[PDB]
Amino acid sequence: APLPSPKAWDVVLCISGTLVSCENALVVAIIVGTPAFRAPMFLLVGSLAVADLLAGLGLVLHFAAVFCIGSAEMSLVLVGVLAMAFTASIGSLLAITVDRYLSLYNALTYYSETTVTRTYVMLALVWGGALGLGLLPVLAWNCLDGLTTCGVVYPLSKNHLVVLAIAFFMVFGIMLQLYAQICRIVCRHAATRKGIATLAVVLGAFAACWLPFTVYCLLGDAHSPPLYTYLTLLPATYNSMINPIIYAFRNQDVQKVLWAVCMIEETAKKVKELGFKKAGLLATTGTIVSGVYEKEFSKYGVEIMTPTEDEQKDVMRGIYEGVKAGNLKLGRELLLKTAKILEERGAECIIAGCTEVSVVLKQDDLKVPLIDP
Amino acid sequence: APLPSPKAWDVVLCISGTLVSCENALVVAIIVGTPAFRAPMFLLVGSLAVADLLAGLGLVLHFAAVFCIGSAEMSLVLVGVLAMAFTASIGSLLAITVDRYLSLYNALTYYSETTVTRTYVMLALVWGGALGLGLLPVLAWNCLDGLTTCGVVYPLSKNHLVVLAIAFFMVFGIMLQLYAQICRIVCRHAATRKGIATLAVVLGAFAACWLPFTVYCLLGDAHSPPLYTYLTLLPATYNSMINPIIYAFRNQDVQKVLWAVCMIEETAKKVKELGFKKAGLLATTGTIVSGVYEKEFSKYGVEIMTPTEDEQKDVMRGIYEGVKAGNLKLGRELLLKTAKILEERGAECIIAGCTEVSVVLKQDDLKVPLIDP
């Protein structure tokens, strides 16, 4: 009983897995190495790295099993561990994105607490959650009995593959909505092409790398041509190799370690380019309290001025009790007196943080330039 | 060529469709009737109502066509318009929930023209997608022709049903993440039992009535028993009939016109029950500015006092530069002079809006009771 000589696609898969493991070995090594990199966000990156390394090891071991080994059960356990690793990688991506969202959101409500209630509950639910879906394909969902349809990848039952695809589509939807929220929040703290490209390649790469296999899984059949599955399984390993370059090496702290081994932002730009060192502000009380303008304009060395709390309440009325309420005259009067006193105090430019200020106040009403977002 | 006598499941479906149409007719008529009900969020409810009415009309017309008409083209266009209506219904539900979430996210900027543009774009997009995945695919690419291996519902191709199922699962993921966010953000104005029950029941209502079928969409083929299809389609009509009771028919002004035709809430009510009319607050600057605490306690007639701006900055240091920074002594120092001056001014009780205050402040340190969230 000699082992048939594998076709070239087998050695292509072997090379892909080999470079995947080689690429991730260094990243897991450095992640686990330096004692300083024990931040809560680093644990998720480590989880992703070890999951992908496990995937590569499983792939090369399976190729070995199909190369002068001639075994039966080891092939089954290797396909099981491969499914384990892929589900773990998808869970690591979801956990990373949810951590990033919760990080960038908490800087507005100003309420941060706990590290064991949140990080470990989801870190243990991605590897632990994959236990069931990595033990089902071996326990009682095999193809050797004969009753199972054994749809696409031999041996895997139709039901198990369908369940996996449903889970994948669910997590894709959650990821899409999360990225929409993060883009909406980060746009405010900003041109259009750069803003889109900030988060447009990662989601496109994820989709273009993982969609074809699941689409085939749904549409396929047992008697499908054999080259189709081999053609569609490559993007999964390609994403496995791409992901650590884009989610781990981009962080500049690891870059420093290696080198040792080896709408408001643009407004601030415009203000700094005009040579003005002092700006006055008219906006809502929440906006001034939020502290965004001070940090953004201090990043370029520009100082902002907000009137006193009584004139803050005056601007409150002028915007909402004034322009917004239909009493345009009161709004323009209050805004004009506030702008006048601010200009007298030494401001060379005035910023109208909301549209209502621009509605009743124009350039001709001020000696200094009037600039709006 | 006589028409075979339908099975009793057919008249069951007819009864369900008639009830759906009758229930939705009144609500759509009332919504379109009163000129005062032209709010931006009323348009989405109207769209959902018209979609459900269209679905009911399509179902009853299809039963009619399969009864003593014996026509082929009419049945085809009727099943097409049925798919049209169901897709429109699910899209309208998603639009309603996204509108609610954006409305509850920010309250100041919700009432403007921006929400008008958003509403118009959402309505156009949902009905255009209904056009693109409804009548247009069904009046082509069908089964009443050469071999297409049409799937469970006669006549519908396998590929069309798979595409519909994929879209449904993506929409389900979006809905799940939205409801998680809304449940997170409403459990700060809390009592909690009512909110958690609502946000766990209205989700399951749509989750358990539309997913007997989309799973059968995949695990099945033409050579399938006919009992398994006529049973899983009933929950869709049941959800169609249940929908205009949950999202609509629950607000109060609709009730009035019908009759004419026919964690902080808990603390605030606890303080109110104790008989205290005056409370003092220690929390972050953003929290005191945000206007939540005073609004909630004024809902019960309780007055909250916040320290002056200098003492607010002192509390800022005591929380962050103090307890949070590791200099616990400075934090407790600043917090306890703050509590002392507030108590001397007439505070009958003190609230610690952050855990940091409670860490270094205990009940024995003040004469008045100390209450924490």
Curated annotation (Swiss-Prot), chains A, B:
Which residue ranges traverse the bilayer? 9-28, 41-64, 77-98, 120-139, 165-183, 196-222, 228-249
Positions in the Cytoplasmic compartment: 29-40, 99-119
What are the recorded GO MF terms, alphabetically?
G protein-coupled receptor activity; sphingosine-1-phosphate receptor activity
Q: How is this protein positioned relative to the membrane?
A: Multi-pass membrane protein
Question: Single Gene Ontology BP term?
Answer: positive regulation of cold-induced thermogenesis
Q: In which tissues is it expressed?
A: Expressed predominantly in the central nervous system, and at low levels in the lung, kidney, testis, ovary and eye. Highly expressed in regions of the brain implicated in the Alzheimer disease.
User: According to its UniProt record, which protein family does this protein belong to?
Assistant: Belongs to the G-protein coupled receptor 1 family.
The entry's function note states: Constitutively active G-protein coupled receptor that maintains high 3'-5'-cyclic adenosine monophosphate (cAMP) levels that a plays a role in serveral processes including meiotic arrest in oocytes or neuronal development via activation of numerous intracellular signaling pathways. Acts as an essential activator of thermogenic adipocytes and drives thermogenesis via its intrinsic G(s)-coupling activity without the requirement of a ligand. Has a potential role in modulating a number of brain functions, including behavioral responses to stress, amyloid-beta peptide generation in neurons.
Name the UniProt record assigns to this protein: G-protein coupled receptor 3
Q: Which organism is it from?
A: Homo sapiens (Human)
